[PDB]
Amino acid sequence: IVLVDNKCKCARITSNIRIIVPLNNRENISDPTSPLRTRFVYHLSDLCKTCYTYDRNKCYTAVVPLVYGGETKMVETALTPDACYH
Amino acid sequence: DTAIRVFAIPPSFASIFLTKSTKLTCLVTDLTTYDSVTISWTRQNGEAVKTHTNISESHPNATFSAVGEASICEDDWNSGERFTCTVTHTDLPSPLKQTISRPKGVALHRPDVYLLPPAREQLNLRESATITCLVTGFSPADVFVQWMQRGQPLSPEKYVTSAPMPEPQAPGRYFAHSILTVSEEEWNTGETYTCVVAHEALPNRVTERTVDKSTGKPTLYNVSLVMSDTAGTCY
Amino acid sequence: DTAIRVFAIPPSFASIFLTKSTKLTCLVTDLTTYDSVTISWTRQNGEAVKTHTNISESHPNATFSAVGEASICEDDWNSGERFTCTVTHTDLPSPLKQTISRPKGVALHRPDVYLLPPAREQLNLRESATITCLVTGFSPADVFVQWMQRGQPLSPEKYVTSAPMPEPQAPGRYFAHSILTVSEEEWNTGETYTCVVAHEALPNRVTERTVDKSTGKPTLYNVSLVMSDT
């Protein structure tokens, strides 16, 4: 019965049409250092073939620099460590 | 009344994470400021260790700036090996022992980072923005923090951080606090600030949060969502 | 606490604010185990002062570390008076009296208090809530933070406060902070809380701040829906 259950945009169409549109998220998902894209588009045709949310099973990541005593070093950090693994 | 104080510098979590080495030193200050000072180290097993050799000592100006670099692998400290330092002086025959070790056994718990922007009152005052990055419900101690603006790093004196103090509800656990103060122009411009922190209990050992002017309690949304082809093919 | 030394611990500002009275103490270190210690308080002008409220019990340090007690309204301690503990000992023909003063001459600065509500991330978690009170730009470093639930007091165990840390990025303008941990349900109930601070460099010797959900929500919305078959 559930025609489409895209978790990228949380669009579920039971044939009901449910779409959650979280406001807090940066334009670019690759890094947080990007404008805040408030616009949201939900093309049903395209969706039935640039994500906004994050899947529960998906654990994104981005590389960031760190400097303590020596030289700047790049280390990976997960945007949702709870999903990855008080 | 000359008070002979003694200090000891053990390793740090940031050192093991980046330098992956060990650095333990012990010195005495607030006493006769000159050379001819006796210091020695000995592991838990009683064996010798890397003694201070070719290391800096008190300057000729009675400036006590001695340092130490114990070339010992991080694993030995990780086990919490009992390093005993014996500080003695020519005019102080009495011995003075200092035992340093890692506490064996702790209820490791993941940290809980947060980020809050400058209060509306401070921003309205237009004197200096302040951003808070706190870490609650985490143990053990020795957590490093760093701050970054627009991806690039930032100087240490541009921000301050608190030590891990005991927590009210969780005396075993501790909490840390960091404040970054800047002008009222970068944050007002919309600078996306980021706070990184490295704790042992964390799985990845590193985490971060971020916030900019808009994400800092958006005074107003500008949502303009459009739902093209509400029904077609799919439904 | 050895080698014949007497330390003075005058009433601190936090002690003045809480106990609401002065209690000067002249701890005697390396004091031989000898009772009948005549450590009688006396003003710098030599005027009579209520003697110590007895000597405390013994200690494992084999020294009768006396604890002098004093009481005064408020102004004497604020005035140019200097308390003097006699510290009388039979085995000391030349005893030294411990002097306690109230030094002044420090640059004044208005404490700037900022109360900030629980982080937006904590709202989703729902597991608990925390409130942060930050204080900056003041001197000396003798602040005292307290939390009040609508004027009412609260058990001090449910909150904590850091000491005053320095501010290297400022000309020695000390800063500090404190936290208060509460259950989430309490914060979602919309209750109010107040972070009172006691510091000498104040007009009325107290400052008040408060925040709730009202000052933690957006101002307006600009939603715009667009539905079409295109």
Swiss-Prot record, chain A:
It is found in: Secreted. The gene is JCHAIN. Its main location: secreted. Disulfide bonds join 8-51, 59-84. Glycans are attached at residue 28. Keywords: Disulfide bond, Glycoprotein, Pyrrolidone carboxylic acid, Secreted, Signal. One of its GO terms (biological process) is adaptive immune response. The chain holds residues 28 to 157 of 159 of the full protein. It comes from the Eukaryota. One of its GO terms (molecular function) is IgA binding. This is Immunoglobulin J chain. One of its GO terms (cellular component) is secretory IgA immunoglobulin complex. The keyword Disulfide bond applies. Serves to link two monomer units of either IgM or IgA. In the case of IgM, the J chain-joined dimer is a nucleating unit for the IgM pentamer, and in the case of IgA it induces dimers and/or larger polymers. It also helps to bind these immunoglobulins to secretory component. Part of the secretory IgA (sIgA) complex that consists of two, four or five IgA monomers, and two additional non-Ig polypeptides, namely the JCHAIN and the secretory component (the proteolytic product of PIGR). Part of the secretory IgM (sIgM) complex that consists of five IgM monomers, and two additional non-Ig polypeptides, namely the JCHAIN and the secretory component (the proteolytic product of PIGR). JCHAIN-containing IgM interacts (via CH4 domain) with FCRM (via Ig-like domain).
From Swiss-Prot, chain C:
The basic structural unit of both sIgM and mIgM molecules consists of two identical heavy chains and two identical light chains; disulfide-linked. N-terminal variable regions of the heavy and light chains form the antigen binding sites, whereas the C-terminal constant regions of the heavy chains interact with immune receptors to mediate effector functions. It is linked to Agammaglobulinemia 1, autosomal recessive: A primary immunodeficiency characterized by profoundly low or absent serum antibodies and low or absent circulating B cells due to an early block of B-cell development. Affected individuals develop severe infections in the first years of life. N-glycosylated; important for IgM secretion and its localization at the plasma membrane. The interaction with FCMR is glycan-independent. Constant region of immunoglobulin heavy chains. Immunoglobulins, also known as antibodies, are membrane-bound or secreted glycoproteins produced by B lymphocytes. In the recognition phase of humoral immunity, the membrane-bound immunoglobulins serve as receptors which, upon binding of a specific antigen, trigger the clonal expansion and differentiation of B lymphocytes into immunoglobulins-secreting plasma cells. Secreted immunoglobulins mediate the effector phase of humoral immunity, which results in the elimination of bound antigens. The chain holds residues 219 to 433 of 474 of the full protein. Disulfide bonds join 26-85, 133-195. Residues 11-101, 111-212 form the Ig-like domain. Changing residue 212 to A: Blocks IgM BCR assembly. This is Immunoglobulin heavy constant mu. Changing residue 146 to A: Has no effect on IgM BCR assembly. The gene is IGHM. Glycans are attached at residues 54, 61. Residues 106-215 are annotated as: CH4. Residues 1-105 are annotated as: CH3.
